[PDB]
Amino acid sequence: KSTFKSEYPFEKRKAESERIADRFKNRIPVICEKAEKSDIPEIDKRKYLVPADLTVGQFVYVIRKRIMLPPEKAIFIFVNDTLPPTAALMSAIYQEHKDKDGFLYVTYSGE
């Protein structure tokens, strides 16, 4: 109902993402939210700790599973309002598009 980012104070985020960068050597913190104008369901959880070696596509696979979104319906992940290549590694998108607060913000829609 409210973009995670606007939901908490910077220091609260940078603190956590930093505590995350400590407790997990090869994991990645991802905030995954629904595009405002997409019909597809709103996920229950939006903070993920994705494995270093995980690809975009695979991560998509995970989101689909989370909303129980049927193979006919299409979904799309965006980063910085861009469509990362499905073959990419999440870590790479992170190191290249993370937020100043330490998280990699990702949105999904399909419609």
Binding site: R27, P29, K45, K47, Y48, L49, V50, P51, L54, F59, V62
Partner: peptide, 6 residues
């Protein structure tokens, strides 16, 4: 809070 992927 956080959901870890395997």
């Amino acid at each position: 809070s956080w959901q870890a992927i395997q």
